[PDB]
Amino acid sequence: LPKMMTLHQQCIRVLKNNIDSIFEVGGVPYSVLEPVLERCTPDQLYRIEEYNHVLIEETDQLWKVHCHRDFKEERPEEYESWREMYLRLQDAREQ
């Protein structure tokens, strides 16, 4: 890799290779954790959010990137954050 990386970039590229290693984030703000969570897949987001609940209200806009990739024909209705819509449609489609 003929690239120079600062500490932010080093940590987030390593963590962008091993998202699966994250169990509990500790106390990192989402604004720091914004890159590694955008290159991610919704099951891993469910795992992260159900181990690290305090992130939930921060990550909802992230779910939109998933929703328009998995349910591109859809839009949220009112009183529907993107996480709960994605889980409702995901379980409805599996059923």
Binding site: V65, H68, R69, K72
Partner: protein
Amino acid sequence: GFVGIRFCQECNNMLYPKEDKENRILLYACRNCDYQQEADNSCIYVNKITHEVDELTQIIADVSQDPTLPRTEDHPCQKCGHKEAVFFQSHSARAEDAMRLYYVCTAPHCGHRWTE
């Protein structure tokens, strides 16, 4: 520019070019029924002999989902800034004279396609 097929409305057939010398202008007339219509564009027919220099408009964004296509992270998307993009050569019969690479952004909801 190209000329397309203009269709009749009475029988939905093809309109053929014709002239009127009383008005001395150009009209597309239907010769199945008796419909006539004044023609907007004067160009009746055009050759595009060397107008194959463009291939970007035939590319679709769905090729971002092709797993057999080469992916690069050294050509970021201009429209949305996504780091990753697929690249490929042209698949036309006009690609015998060019190994030119075309790039498609692999981010969903963007689908931006460019060249070099």
